[PDB]
Short mmCIF file of C-alpha atoms in Angstrom, two decimals:
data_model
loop_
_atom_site.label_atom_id
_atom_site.label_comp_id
_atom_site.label_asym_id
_atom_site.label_seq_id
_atom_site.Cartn_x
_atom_site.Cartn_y
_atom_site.Cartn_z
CA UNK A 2 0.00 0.00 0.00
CA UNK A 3 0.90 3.72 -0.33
CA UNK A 4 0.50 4.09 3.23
CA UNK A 5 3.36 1.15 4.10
CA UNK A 6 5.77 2.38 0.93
CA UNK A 7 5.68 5.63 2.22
CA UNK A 8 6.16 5.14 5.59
CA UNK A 9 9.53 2.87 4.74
CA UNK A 10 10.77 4.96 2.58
CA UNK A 11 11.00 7.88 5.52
CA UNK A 23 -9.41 1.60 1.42
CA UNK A 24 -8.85 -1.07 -1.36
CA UNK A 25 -12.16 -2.57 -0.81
CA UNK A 26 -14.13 0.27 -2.76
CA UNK A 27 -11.38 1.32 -5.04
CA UNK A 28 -10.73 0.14 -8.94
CA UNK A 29 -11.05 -3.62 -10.17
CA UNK A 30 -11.96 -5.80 -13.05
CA UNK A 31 -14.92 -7.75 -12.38
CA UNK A 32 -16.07 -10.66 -15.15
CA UNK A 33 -20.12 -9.33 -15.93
CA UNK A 34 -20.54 -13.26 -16.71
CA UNK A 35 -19.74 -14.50 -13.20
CA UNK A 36 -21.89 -15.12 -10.26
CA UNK A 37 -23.32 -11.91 -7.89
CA UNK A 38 -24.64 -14.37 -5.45
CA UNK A 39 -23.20 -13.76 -2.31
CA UNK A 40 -21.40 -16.81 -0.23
CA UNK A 41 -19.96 -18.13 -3.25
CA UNK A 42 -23.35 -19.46 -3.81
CA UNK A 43 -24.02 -21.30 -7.71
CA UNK A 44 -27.21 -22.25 -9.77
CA UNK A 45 -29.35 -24.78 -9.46
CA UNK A 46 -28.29 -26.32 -13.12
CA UNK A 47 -23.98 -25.38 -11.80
CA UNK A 48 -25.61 -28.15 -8.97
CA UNK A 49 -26.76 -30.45 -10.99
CA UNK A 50 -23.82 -30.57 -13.48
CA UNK A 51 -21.38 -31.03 -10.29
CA UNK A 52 -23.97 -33.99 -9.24
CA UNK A 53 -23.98 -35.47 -12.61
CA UNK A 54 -19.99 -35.44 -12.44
CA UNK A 55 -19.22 -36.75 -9.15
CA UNK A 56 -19.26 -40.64 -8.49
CA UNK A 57 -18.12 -40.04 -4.45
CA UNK A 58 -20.21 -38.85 -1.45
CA UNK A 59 -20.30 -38.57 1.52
CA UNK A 60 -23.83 -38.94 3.56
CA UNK A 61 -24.83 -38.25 7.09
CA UNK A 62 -27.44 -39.92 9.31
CA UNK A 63 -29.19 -40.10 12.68
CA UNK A 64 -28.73 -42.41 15.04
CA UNK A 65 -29.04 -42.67 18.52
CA UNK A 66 -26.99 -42.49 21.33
CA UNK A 67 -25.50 -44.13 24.43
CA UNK A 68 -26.90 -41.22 26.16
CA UNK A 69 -30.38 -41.09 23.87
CA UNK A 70 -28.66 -38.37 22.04
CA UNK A 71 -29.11 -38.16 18.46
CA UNK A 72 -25.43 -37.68 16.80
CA UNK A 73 -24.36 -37.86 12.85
CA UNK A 74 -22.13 -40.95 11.14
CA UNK A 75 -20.99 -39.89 8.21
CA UNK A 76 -20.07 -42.44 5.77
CA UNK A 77 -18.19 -42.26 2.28
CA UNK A 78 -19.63 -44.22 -0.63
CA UNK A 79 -20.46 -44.14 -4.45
CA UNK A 80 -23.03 -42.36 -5.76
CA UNK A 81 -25.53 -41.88 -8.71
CA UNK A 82 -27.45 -38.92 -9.03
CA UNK A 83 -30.87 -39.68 -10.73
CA UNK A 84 -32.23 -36.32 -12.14
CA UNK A 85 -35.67 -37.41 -13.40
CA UNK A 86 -36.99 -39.45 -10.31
CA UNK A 87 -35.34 -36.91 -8.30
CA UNK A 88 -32.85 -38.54 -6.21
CA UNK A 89 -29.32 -39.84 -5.39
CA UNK A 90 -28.97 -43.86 -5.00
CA UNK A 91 -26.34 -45.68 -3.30
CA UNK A 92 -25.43 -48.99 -1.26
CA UNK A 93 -24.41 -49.55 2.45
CA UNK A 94 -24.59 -51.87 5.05
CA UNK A 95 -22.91 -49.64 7.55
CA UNK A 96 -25.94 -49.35 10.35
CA UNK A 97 -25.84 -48.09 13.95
CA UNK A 98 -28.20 -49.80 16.87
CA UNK A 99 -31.20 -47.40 16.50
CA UNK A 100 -32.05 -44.73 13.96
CA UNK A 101 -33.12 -41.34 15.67
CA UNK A 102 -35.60 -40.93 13.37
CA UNK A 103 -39.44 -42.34 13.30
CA UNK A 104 -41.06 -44.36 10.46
CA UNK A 105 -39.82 -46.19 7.26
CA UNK A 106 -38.05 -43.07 5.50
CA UNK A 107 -34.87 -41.37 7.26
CA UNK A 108 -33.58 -37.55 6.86
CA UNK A 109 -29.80 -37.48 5.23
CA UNK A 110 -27.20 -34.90 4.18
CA UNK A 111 -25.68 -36.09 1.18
CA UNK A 112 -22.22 -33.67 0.29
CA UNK A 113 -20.38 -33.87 -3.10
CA UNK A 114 -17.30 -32.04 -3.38
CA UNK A 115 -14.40 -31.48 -5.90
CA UNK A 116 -11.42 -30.41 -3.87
CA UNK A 117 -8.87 -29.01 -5.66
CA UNK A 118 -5.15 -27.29 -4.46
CA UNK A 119 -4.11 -25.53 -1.32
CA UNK A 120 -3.47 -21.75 -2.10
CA UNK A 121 -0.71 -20.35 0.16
CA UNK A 122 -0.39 -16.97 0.90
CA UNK A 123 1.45 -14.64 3.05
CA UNK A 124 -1.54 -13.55 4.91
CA UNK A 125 -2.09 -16.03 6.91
CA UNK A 126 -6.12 -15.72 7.17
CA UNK A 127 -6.18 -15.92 3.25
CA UNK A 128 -4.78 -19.46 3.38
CA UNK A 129 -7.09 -21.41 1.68
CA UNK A 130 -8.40 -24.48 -0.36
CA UNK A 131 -10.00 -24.65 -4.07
CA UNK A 132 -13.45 -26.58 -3.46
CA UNK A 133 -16.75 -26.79 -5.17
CA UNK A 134 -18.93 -28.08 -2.68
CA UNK A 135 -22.79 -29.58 -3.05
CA UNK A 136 -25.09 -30.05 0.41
CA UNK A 137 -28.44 -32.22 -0.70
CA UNK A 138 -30.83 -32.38 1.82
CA UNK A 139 -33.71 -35.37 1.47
CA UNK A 140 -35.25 -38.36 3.01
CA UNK A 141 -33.61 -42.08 2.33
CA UNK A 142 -35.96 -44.88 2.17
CA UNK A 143 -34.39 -49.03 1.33
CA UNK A 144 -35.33 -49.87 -2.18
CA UNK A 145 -36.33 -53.41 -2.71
CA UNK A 146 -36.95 -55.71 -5.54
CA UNK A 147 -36.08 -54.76 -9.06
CA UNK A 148 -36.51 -51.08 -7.44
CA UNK A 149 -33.55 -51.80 -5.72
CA UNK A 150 -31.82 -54.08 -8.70
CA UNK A 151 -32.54 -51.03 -11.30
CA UNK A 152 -31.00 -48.55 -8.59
CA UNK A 153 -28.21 -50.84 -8.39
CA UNK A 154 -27.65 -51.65 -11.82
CA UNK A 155 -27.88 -46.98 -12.41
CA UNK A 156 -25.56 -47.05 -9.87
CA UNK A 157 -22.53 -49.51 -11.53
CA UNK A 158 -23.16 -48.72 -15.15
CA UNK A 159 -22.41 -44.54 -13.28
CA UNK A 160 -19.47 -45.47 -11.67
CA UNK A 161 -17.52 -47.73 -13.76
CA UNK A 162 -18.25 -46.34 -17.28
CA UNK A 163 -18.61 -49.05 -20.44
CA UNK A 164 -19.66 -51.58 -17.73
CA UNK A 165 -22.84 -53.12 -18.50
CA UNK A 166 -24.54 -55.57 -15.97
CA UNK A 167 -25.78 -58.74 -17.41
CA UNK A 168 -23.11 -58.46 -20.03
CA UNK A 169 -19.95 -57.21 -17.92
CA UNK A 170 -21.23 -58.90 -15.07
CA UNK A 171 -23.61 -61.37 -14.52
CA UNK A 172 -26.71 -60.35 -13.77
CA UNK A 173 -28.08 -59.11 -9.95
CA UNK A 174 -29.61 -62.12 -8.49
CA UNK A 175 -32.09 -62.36 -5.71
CA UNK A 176 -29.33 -63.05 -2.94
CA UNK A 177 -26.94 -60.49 -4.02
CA UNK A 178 -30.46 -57.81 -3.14
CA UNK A 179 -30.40 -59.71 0.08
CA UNK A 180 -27.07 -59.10 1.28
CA UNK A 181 -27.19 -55.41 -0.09
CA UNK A 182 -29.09 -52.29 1.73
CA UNK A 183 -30.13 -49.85 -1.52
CA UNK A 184 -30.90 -46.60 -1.13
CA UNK A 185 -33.30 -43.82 -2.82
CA UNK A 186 -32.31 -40.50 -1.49
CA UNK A 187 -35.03 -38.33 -2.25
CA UNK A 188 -33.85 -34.57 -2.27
CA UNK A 189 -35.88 -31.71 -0.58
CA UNK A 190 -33.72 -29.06 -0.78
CA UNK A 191 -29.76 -28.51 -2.27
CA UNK A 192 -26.79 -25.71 -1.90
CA UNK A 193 -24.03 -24.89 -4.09
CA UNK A 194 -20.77 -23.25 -3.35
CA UNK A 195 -17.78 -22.63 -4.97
CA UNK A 196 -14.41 -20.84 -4.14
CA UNK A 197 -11.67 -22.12 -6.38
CA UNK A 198 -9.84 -19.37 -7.10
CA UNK A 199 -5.99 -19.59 -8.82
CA UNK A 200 -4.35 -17.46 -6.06
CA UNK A 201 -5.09 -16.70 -2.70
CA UNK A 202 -5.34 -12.79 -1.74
CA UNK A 203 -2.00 -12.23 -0.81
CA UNK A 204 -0.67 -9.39 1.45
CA UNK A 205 1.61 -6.22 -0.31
CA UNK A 206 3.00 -5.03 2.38
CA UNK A 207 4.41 -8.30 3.93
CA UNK A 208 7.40 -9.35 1.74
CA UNK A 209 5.97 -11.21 -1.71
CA UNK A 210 5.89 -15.48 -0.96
CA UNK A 211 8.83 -17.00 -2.78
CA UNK A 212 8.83 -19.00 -6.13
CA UNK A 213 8.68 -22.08 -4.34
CA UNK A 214 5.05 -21.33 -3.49
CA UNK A 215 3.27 -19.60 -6.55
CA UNK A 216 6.02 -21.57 -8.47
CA UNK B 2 -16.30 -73.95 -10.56
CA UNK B 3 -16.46 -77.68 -10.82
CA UNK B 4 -19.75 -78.18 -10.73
CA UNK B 5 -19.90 -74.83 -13.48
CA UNK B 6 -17.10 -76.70 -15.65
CA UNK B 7 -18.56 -80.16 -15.70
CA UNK B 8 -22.05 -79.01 -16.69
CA UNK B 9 -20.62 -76.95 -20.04
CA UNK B 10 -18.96 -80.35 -20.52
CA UNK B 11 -22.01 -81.92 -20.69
CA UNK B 23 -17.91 -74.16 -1.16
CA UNK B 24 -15.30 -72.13 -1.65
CA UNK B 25 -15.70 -70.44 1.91
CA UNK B 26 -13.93 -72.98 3.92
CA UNK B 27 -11.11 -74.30 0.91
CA UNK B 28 -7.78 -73.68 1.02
CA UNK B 29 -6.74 -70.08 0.80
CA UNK B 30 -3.31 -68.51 1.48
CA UNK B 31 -3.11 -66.00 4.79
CA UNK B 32 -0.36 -63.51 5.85
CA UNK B 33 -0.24 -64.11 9.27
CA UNK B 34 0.89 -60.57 9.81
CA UNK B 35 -2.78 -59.23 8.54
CA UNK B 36 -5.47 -57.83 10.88
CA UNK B 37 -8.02 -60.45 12.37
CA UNK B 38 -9.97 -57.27 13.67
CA UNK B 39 -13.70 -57.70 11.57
CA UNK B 40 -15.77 -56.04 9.64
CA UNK B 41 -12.25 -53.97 7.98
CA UNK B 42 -11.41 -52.80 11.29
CA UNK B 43 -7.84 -50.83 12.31
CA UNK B 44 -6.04 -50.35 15.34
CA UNK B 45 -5.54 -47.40 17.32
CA UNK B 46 -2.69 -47.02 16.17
CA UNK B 47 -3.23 -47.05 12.01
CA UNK B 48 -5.88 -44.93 12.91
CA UNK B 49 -3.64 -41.97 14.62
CA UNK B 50 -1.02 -42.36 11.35
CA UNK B 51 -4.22 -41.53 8.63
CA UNK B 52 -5.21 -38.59 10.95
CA UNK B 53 -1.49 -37.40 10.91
CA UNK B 54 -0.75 -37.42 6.81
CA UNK B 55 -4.77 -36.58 6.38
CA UNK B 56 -5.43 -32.34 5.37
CA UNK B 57 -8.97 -32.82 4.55
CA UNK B 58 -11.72 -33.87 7.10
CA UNK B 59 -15.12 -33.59 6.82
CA UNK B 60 -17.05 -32.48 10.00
CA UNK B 61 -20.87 -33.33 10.69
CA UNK B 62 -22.85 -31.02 13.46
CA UNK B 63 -26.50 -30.99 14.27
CA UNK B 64 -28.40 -27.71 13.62
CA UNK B 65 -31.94 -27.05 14.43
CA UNK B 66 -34.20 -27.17 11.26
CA UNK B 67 -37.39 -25.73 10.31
CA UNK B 68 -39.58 -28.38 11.42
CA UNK B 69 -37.36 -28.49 15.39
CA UNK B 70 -35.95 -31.94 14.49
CA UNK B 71 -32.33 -32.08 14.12
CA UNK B 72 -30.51 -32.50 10.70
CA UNK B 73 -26.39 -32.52 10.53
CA UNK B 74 -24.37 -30.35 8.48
CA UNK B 75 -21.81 -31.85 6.25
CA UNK B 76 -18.35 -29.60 5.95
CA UNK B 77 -15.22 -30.47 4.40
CA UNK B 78 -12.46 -28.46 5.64
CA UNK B 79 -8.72 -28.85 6.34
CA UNK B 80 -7.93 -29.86 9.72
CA UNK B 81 -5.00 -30.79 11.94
CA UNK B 82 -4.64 -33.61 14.67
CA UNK B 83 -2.67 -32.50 17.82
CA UNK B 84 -2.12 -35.86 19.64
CA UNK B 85 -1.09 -34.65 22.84
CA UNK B 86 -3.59 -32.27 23.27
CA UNK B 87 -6.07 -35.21 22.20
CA UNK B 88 -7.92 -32.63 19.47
CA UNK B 89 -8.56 -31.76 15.95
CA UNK B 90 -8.71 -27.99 15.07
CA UNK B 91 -10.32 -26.50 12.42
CA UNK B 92 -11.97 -22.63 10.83
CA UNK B 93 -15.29 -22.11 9.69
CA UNK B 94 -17.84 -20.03 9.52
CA UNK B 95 -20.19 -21.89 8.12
CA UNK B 96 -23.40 -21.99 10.60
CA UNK B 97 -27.07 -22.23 10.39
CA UNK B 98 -29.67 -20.61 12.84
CA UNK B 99 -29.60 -22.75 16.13
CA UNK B 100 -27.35 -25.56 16.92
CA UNK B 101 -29.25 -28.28 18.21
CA UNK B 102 -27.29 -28.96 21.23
CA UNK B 103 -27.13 -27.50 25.01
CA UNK B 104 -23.45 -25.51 26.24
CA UNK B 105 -20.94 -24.03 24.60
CA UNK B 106 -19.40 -27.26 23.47
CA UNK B 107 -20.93 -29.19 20.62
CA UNK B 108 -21.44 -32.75 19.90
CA UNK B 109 -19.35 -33.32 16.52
CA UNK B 110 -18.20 -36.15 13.92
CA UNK B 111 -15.29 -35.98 11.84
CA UNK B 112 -14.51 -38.15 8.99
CA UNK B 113 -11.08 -38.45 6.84
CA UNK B 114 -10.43 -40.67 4.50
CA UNK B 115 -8.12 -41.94 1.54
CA UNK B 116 -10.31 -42.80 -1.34
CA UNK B 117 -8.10 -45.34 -4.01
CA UNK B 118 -9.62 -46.76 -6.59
CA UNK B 119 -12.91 -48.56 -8.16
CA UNK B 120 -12.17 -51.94 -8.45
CA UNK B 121 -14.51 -53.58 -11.68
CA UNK B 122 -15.47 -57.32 -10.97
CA UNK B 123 -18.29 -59.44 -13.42
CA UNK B 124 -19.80 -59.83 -10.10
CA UNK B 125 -22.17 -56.87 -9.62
CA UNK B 126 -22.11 -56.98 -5.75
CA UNK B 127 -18.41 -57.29 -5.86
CA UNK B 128 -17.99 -53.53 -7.45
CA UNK B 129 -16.26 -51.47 -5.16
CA UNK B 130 -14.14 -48.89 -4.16
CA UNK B 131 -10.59 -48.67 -2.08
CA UNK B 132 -11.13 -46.86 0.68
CA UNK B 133 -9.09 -46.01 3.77
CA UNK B 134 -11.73 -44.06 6.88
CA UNK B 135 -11.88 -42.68 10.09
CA UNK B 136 -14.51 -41.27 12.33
CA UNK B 137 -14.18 -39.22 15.06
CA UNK B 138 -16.75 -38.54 17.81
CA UNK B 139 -16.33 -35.50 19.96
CA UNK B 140 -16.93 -32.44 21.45
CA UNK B 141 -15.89 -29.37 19.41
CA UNK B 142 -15.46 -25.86 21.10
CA UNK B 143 -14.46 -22.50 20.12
CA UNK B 144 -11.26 -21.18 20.60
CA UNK B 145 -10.16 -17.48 21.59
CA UNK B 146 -7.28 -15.55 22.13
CA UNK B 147 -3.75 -17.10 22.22
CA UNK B 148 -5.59 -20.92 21.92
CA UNK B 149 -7.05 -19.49 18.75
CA UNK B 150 -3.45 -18.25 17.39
CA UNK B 151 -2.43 -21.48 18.66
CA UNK B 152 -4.40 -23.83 17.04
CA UNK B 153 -4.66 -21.81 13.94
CA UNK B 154 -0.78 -21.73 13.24
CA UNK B 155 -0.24 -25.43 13.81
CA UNK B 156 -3.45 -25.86 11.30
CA UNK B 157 -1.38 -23.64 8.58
CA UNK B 158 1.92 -25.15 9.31
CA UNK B 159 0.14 -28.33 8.88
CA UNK B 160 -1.44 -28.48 5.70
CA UNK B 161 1.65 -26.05 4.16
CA UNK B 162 4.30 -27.58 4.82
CA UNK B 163 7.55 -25.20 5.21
CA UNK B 164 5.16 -22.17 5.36
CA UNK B 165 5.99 -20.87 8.83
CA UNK B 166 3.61 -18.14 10.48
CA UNK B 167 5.40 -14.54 11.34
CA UNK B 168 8.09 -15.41 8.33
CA UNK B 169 6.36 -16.96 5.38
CA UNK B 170 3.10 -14.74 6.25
CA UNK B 171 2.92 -11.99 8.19
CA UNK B 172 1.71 -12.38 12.00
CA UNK B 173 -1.90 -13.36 12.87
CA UNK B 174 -3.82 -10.54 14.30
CA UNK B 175 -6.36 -9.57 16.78
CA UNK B 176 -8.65 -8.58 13.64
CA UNK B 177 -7.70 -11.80 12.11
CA UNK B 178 -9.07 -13.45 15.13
CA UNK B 179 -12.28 -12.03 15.02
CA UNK B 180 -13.26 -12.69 11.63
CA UNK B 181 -12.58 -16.53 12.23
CA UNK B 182 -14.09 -19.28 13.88
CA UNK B 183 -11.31 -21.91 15.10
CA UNK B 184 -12.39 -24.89 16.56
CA UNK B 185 -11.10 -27.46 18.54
CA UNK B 186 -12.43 -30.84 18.72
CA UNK B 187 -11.64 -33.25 21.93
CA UNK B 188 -11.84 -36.74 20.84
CA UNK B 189 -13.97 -39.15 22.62
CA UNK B 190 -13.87 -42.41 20.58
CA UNK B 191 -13.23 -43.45 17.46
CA UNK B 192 -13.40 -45.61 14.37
CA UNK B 193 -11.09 -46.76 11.87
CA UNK B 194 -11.83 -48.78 8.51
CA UNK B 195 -9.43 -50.09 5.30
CA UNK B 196 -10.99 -52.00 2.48
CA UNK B 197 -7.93 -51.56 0.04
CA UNK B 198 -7.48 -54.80 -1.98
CA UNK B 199 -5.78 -54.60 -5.76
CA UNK B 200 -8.54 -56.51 -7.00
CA UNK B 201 -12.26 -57.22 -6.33
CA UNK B 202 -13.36 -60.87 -5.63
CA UNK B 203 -14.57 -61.74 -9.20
CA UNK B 204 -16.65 -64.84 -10.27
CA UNK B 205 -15.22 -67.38 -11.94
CA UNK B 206 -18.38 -68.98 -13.31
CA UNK B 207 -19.15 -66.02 -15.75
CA UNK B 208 -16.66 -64.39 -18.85
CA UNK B 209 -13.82 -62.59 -17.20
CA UNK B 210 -13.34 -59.38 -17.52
CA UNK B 211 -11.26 -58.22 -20.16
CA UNK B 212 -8.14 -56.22 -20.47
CA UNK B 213 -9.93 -52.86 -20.77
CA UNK B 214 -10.76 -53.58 -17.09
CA UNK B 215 -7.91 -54.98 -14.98
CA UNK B 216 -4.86 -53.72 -17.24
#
């Protein structure tokens, strides 16, 4: 700054800058609905959180990594687990869940230290997962594999799903309510001028 | 299988199989305490689960990824964000919290459908997190930096952390109660031998 210069050689927030018209105004680093989508169509990783109760009767969150399949026309995510607690804290057949897709990208060092920061695009869903059964649960399934490992084709690739194999397997339809987008992935950090400039073995 | 073979001509579980007696017996994929403290040392990214109170009263967790960094003798995690919703739902300054890192490999193809899967390496945490101030804040913050960059050092690499940088950030630290550690990381998935094997577009 002028202020710093000055003063060694004896505010920017409403001056000058270039601003993109084409990028986002929403505050938060908040995206679109369709930016959403697009990341949900791209992932194949999630991670999902769940209910369950307590030693003390508590309810407190597991949160459990797994693949994923985003289903844009019946409205939901699908995926497998067999990870359980004892009880859900939750009453009847359907269960809330948090399902979060990110993209994390690079660390972005700085030389002001509260501008240290990650690149991340970040997706919250928030819905109701119900156990799928029967060829609901087999066409999930089968969505789900052909998603994650592309050219794979079950029946062909792999034999096909058989009655035990949905027996062994907990499927589930994650129906979404409500979704957020964020994204912060910017190619430098906000550095500091009047702190001597990070080295090329940073930016470099 | 024989009984696969001799019909185009026309169990398994208890056979012989080859062990490293070195190899967990722990079930279900489980770690020691150990294994678990060395992925929560080379870890940066965690993702953190906390209950807010939702429009309805019930419950629902928050998923946030976020870097992180284990202190072992202090027995915590610390973390910044401030990321919040309206209420927590939760009673004290403390909070109930679950953290999750893992190391996601790869998807492992099989032409058994309910064979597909994915290497994984996970931990979850269950704690308490709580707000930091003051010197803790500093504290916890620098180690976090110093952490995830390595050979950036705080009051050299970036200028010193200030009072004003303090109160723009919410630092956390979380005080492990228990946790949970999980490694399903084989080169290949279990494939079936009574149905064309994959070809060399999958396993080479």
């Amino acid at each position: 700054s002028y202020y710093h210069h000055h003063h060694h050689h004896l505010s920017d927030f409403y001056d000058p800058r270039e601003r993109d018209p084409s990028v986002s105004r929403r505050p938060q680093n908040r995206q679109s609905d369709e930016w959403i989508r697009e990341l949900l169509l791209r992932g194949t990783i999630a991670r999902v959180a769940t209910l369950w109760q307590g030693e003390d009767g508590a309810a407190f969150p597991f949160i459990t990594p797994l693949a994923y399949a985003y289903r844009p026309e019946q409205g939901d995510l699908v995926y497998h687990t067999n990870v359980v607690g004892r009880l859900r804290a939750n009453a009847g057949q359907g269960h809330p869940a948090t399902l979060e897709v990110s993209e994390i990208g690079q660390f972005l060092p700085s030389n002001s230290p509260l501008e240290l920061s990650v690149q991340y695009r970040s997706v919250m869903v928030f819905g109701t997962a119900r156990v799928l059964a029967g060829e609901d649960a087999r066409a999930a399934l089968t969505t789900l594999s052909e998603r994650v490992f592309p050219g794979l084709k079950v029946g062909e690739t792999t034999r096909p799903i058989s009655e035990d194999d949905l027996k062994r397997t907990s499927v589930y339809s994650l129906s979404i309510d409500r979704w957020s987008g964020k994204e912060n992935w910017a190619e430098q950090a906000i550095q500091e001028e009047d702190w001597p400039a990070l080295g090329p073995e940073w930016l470099g």
